[PDB]
Structures are given as structure tokens and as C-alpha cells.
Amino acid sequence: GEELIKEEMPMKVVLEGTVNGHQFKCTGEGEGRPYEGVQTMRIKVIEGGPLPFAFDILATSFSRTFVKHPKGIPDYFKQSFPEGFTWERVMRFEDGGVVTVTQDTSLQDGVLIYNAKVRGVNFPSNGPVMQKKTKGWEPNTEMIYPADGGLRGYTDMALKVDGGGHLHCSFVTEYRSKKTVGNIKMPGVYAIDHRLERIEESDNETYVVQREVAVAKYS
Amino acid sequence: GEELIKEEMPMKVVLEGTVNGHQFKCTGEGEGRPYEGVQTMRIKVIEGGPLPFAFDILATSFSRTFVKHPKGIPDYFKQSFPEGFTWERVMRFEDGGVVTVTQDTSLQDGVLIYNAKVRGVNFPSNGPVMQKKTKGWEPNTEMIYPADGGLRGYTDMALKVDGGGHLHCSFVTEYRSKKTVGNIKMPGVYAIDHRLERIEESDNETYVVQREVAVAKYS
């Protein structure tokens, strides 16, 4: 199941959704080193652009297959191939904005296929997200707990704003293998340090180039 | 700390809210035995009644102080006193409904005072809750995870429907002590078996009487 995940993997992504009623569709090509914990994604806002909202709220939803796990932490994400896995996420911002996500990771002729459905609601008209006054996410740590065949992931994320403040955001993620038959070796409690860095952007953020480093460590 | 939490305790509660566009305000009088894990709440919809929706979507928002904790699992909620605690919750329904709750638990002359704001959006116009076709929640289990000075709660809740079906609803809760000085003893990952049943209702569901039994167990 892990032998399918090579030292380099391309990936292709669709992301559809609505934020405060504004409908949109994004596509993405990219690649990385899954055992090194690094990946790059070229994103096009192909429909409903330019978004009346910070692309930062979508950025976290275009890939936990590309996490460097040391020897003694078994990798739930790479074991779930060839079927892949799903994740369901709730994002609560402190200004009242909530996002619900549902993603399907799959594998098709050695390409990783992301399909994500995003539903954001109750963003204040005058807040930093609806006003596009955001400067990316701070580096952070997701706590990983096993949960009856799956994993749950908790992160207290920090979205930088204009004037050098932060808009604090709770991520809760439930990861769930699509392998039913097979002895997936489960981890214990552990932690994933991740750094999402915007590398490029053009045309009122309708083109975005992202790079995430993510390394696992014992907890 | 726990000395302020007696073998009986009254409670009084306010709940204000907007579900889809409809405004309401509920008040509650009740009591229970927090070391026995039992409590009873007599609620009335005082404004915006009769609600054009299932009270079952407010029912879980009117108190983890009333949980039986075996010797070895220390009670984060009873240690919070006298300042008490706050919880923030998101309720994701599979049919699309989203509920955000912010509640304040506090203590005033040996009475627990509950204050809760509820916002619900994107409930399908012809869904079971907008159509009042619900018959209470199933008994379930909340998984409780530590955090930096706080607790994370997750439940896959099941709302019973006319016919015999279920609306599946993921509950994500963040608990936070208002005690910022002196050493609260933190628990590890544990579980709360909780069963909420409606004892009595009347006048178009604008008077409601409900009992929760809730007991902690090792994970």
C-alpha cells in the first residue's frame, strides 16, 4: 500500500464551494516528495473569480500524504493506498466565520486525485477575510489522536492580518482510510509541525502557487 | 475548587439565538447531582415561540459540570470554580445545517448561571428540523482530548427522524476554564457516555423538560 506512494508524486485537485453564498471552482496541478514532507501546488481560480474573499481560507484544503514520519511512527496516510482516504474539517474563526470541508484523496495511474467541497458561512462583511486583508497562516502543530479505524487532528491556527495582528482559527479534522480489508498499523498520539508558505500569486489572487513543509514528531 | 460544587446544585440559563433567519430567547430553571451525573432542566421558549424548528437542535445547548468522574479521571469542569468555564461548539448536519454556539458557565451564590448564544444557518427549507419531524437524540459518547489549558470534545451524534431514520451530526466542542491562576490537574484522553431524554413538553414545544445522565470512562 506504501510501495504505491513513490519518492516523487504528481497530484491534481478540484475544489468547489460557496463562501457567504459566493460560488467558485478552483483546479490545481503540483508535485512533491512524500517521504521528505514537502510539496508545491499551482492553483487557478477558474470560476467565480476574483473571489470577494481571502484565498487563505481555501489554501489549507489543497494533502497529509506528504508528511515526513520518522521510523517509529506508522504513517496512516501512505498505508491507505491504493484506495486513499477522506478528511472532514471544521474551521471556526474567532470573528464568527465557520468553514466545513469534505475531501476525497484517491490514486489513479500514479497520480494523487484531490476533490474538496468547501462551505464557509457567517464571515462578517467588514472582517479581514471578506475584506482580503490577510498575510497567510503562521507555522503551527496538529495533534493527531487515533479514533476507531481513523485519526482526529486538532490545530490552533493563526491567520496573520493587516497591522500585524492575528485572526485565530480552530481546525478540527477527522481522517478516515478507504481501506476496509487490511491490517493498517495504527499510530499512537503524535504531532505534525506544518508550514504553509505562499510562493507566488497573480491577477487579484486567481493564480496561486503554494509550498507546504510538514514533519511528524513523537508526543 | 470542587468544595463549591455540592451534592445538589440548582441552575438557571438564558439562550438567545437565530436559526435560519428566525430569532428566539429561552430561559431555564433546573437542578441535579454532579457527582451522580444526573440533572433535570425545565425550559420555556419566552420569545419567538412557537419556533419554526425542532427544539432538539437547542436541547444539547442547555452542562458538563454534571458528569460522574471515576476517582482516577480528574474533573476539569468542577476545578474551574469559582470562575467556571465557557464552551464553543459547531454542529455540522449532513443535510447542510450549521449551528455555532458560545456558552458561559459561572457561579453566583451557589447557583450555576448558563448564558448561550446560538446561530444556525443553511437548514434545508424542507429538511426534518425545519419541518419539526425529529424524535430526540440517541445515547452517544463524547471523546474528550486535552489542549493548552482547555479540552476538545468530539461526538458523532444521531438525531432521530419520523419514519425511524437519523440525521447524523458531528459535534465539535472546545471547553476553556476561566481560572487562569493555580494548578487545575489536567486529564488525559477520555470519554463521556451521555444520554439526553425529553421527559415532558407542551404548548407547541414552548415548555420542555429534559434529564441528562452523563458518566466518564477510561479510553
Residues A172, A192: Cα–Cα separation, whole Å: 14
Which of B119, B121, B152 lies nearest to residue A154, judging by beta carbons?
A: B152
A88 chain-B contacts, CB cut-off 8 A: 92, 170
Q: Which three cell numbers stand for residue B203?
A: 404548548
Compute the distance between CA of residue A201 and CA of residue A45 in angstroms, rounded to an integer.
Answer: 11
C-alpha torsion B94→B99→B100→B106, nearest 10? -120
Question: Which of A156, A125, A160 minimizes the C-alpha distance to A141?
Answer: A156
Q: What is the sign, positive or negative, of the torsion defined by CA atoms of B61, B64, B65, B68?
A: positive
Cell of A68: 515526513
- Structural domain that includes position A55: 1-219
Q: Is residue A175 within 8 Å of A199, Cβ to Cβ?
A: no
Q: Test B170 with A92 for CB contact under 8 angstroms.
A: no
Residue B2: phi and psi, rounded to 5, are -65, -25
Specify the amino acid at residue A14.
V
Q: Distance between CA B57 and CA A162 in Å, rounded?
A: 37
First to last CA, chain A: 26
- Can you read off the three cell numbers belonging to residue A188? 499512537
Q: How many domains does chain B have?
A: 1
From CA A40, how far away is CA A209, in angstroms rounded?
7
Query: What is the rounded distance in angstroms from the CA atom of residue B46 to the CA atom of residue B206?
Result: 8
Q: Which residues pair with B159 in a beta bridge?
A: B137, B167
> Is A90's CB within 8 Å of B88's CB?
no
Tell me the residue type at A24: F
Q: Which residue has the cell 512533491?
A: A32
- State whether A156 and B148 contact (CB < 8 Å): yes
Task: Name which of B170, B174, B189 is nearest A145 (Cβ-Cβ).
Answer: B189
Distance separating alpha carbons of residues A50 and A204, to the nearest angstrom: 6
Residues in chain A: 219
Contact of B38 with B212, CB cutoff 8 Å: yes
Burial (CB count <10 Å: 0-12, 13-18, 19+), residue B147: middle
Which contacts qualify for A146-149: CB closer than 8 Å, 24 or more apart? A146/A186, A146/A187, A146/A188, A146/A189, A147/A174, A147/B143, A147/B154, A149/A176, A149/A177, A149/A184
Q: How far is B91 from B129, CA to CA, in rounded Å? A: 13
Sign of the Cα torsion B184, B185, B186, B190 reads negative
Question: Chain B contacts of A170, Cβ < 8 Å?
Answer: 88, 172, 174
Q: For residues A89 and A154, give the distance between their C-alpha atoms in angstroms, rounded to a whole number.
A: 10
Nearest to B172 among A90, A147, A156 (CB): A90
One-letter amino acid for residue A74 of the chain: P
Q: For chain B, what's the residue count?
A: 219
Structural biology method used: X-ray
> Cell numbers of A33, please?
516528495
CA distance B73 to chain A (A): 18
Task: Tell me the CA distances in angstroms from A30 to A16, A27, A63, A112, A115, one per residue in order.
Answer: 18, 11, 11, 10, 14
DSSP run (H or E) holding B59: helix B56-59
> Which of A97, A91, A170, A92 is CA-nearest to residue A131?
A97
- Beta strands at B140-147 and B98-107: parallel, antiparallel or unpaired: unpaired
Going by C-alpha positions, the residue among B120, B115, B131 that lies closest to residue B97 is B120
State how far residue A143 is from chain B, nearest Cα, in angstroms.
9
Q: A62 is written with which cell numbers?
A: 489543497
The span from the CA of B2 to the CA of B107, in Å, is: 12
A122: nearest CB among B88, B100, B174: B100
- Distance from C-alpha of A61 to C-alpha of B92, rounded to nearest angstrom: 18
CB contact under 8 A, B174 and A174: no
- Quote the CA–CA distance of B109 and B13 in Å, as a whole number: 15
Chain B residues in contact with A143 (beta carbon < 8 A) = 145, 147
A78: helix, strand or coil: helix
Please name the amino acid found at residue B167. L
A100: which chain B residues are within 8 Å (Cβ-Cβ)? 92, 98
Strands A22-33 and B207-218 come out as unpaired
